[PDB]
Design a binder for these strands. Structure first.
Ligand SMILES: [Cl-]
Ligand SMILES: [Zn+2]
Ligand SMILES: [Zn+2]
Ligand SMILES: [Zn+2]
Length: 117
DNA sequence: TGCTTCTGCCAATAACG
DNA sequence: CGTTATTGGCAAGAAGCA
């Protein structure tokens, strides 16, 4: 009982018992619920900040290494995260990387070990 | 106002038996 | 060891700062 279910128009939703946020996926509810329970801790390996989600920790750790995984394909400049990449492409090249063309490249993470695609 | 950090989807990984 | 369960990387918009 970390949740209850709402069903509307046949659509099933999962509701956090603590903050009442709704989720389409039970996986999302559980991932989210750690924020309340802190059953799992995700400590930074370079400082000792601790995160409630594994992905928050990983994004943070990349800031420590300084790796620049995001590369603008228009001019070659590289950026540490999606937001800097996107902002660059929008302001400098007047294009939207969420459009129908691929304007950037996401290099593999090499400054540390995360699972790979 | 401009950085900065904060859930659906499903591939990669793990757990199971 | 291969079948099922779980993890968490990713996008990109939202929210949270100051
Ligand atoms: Cl780099
Ligand atoms: Zn909650
Ligand atoms: Zn850290
Ligand atoms: Zn560029």
């Amino acid at each position: 009982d970390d949740h209850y279910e709402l069903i509307v128009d046949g659509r099933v939703y999962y509701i956090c018992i603590v903050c009442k946020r709704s989720y389409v996926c039970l996986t999302s509810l559980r991932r989210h619920f750690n924020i309340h329970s802190w059953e799992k801790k995700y400590p930074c390996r370079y400082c000792e900040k601790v995160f409630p989600l594994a992905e928050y920790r990983t994004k943070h750790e990349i800031h420590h290494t300084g790796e620049r995984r995001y590369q603008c394909l228009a001019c070659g400049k590289s950026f540490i995260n999606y937001q800097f990449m996107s902002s660059h492409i929008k302001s400098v090249h007047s294009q939207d990387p969420s459009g129908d063309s691929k304007l950037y490249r996401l290099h593999p993470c090499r400054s540390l070990q995360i699972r790979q695609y």
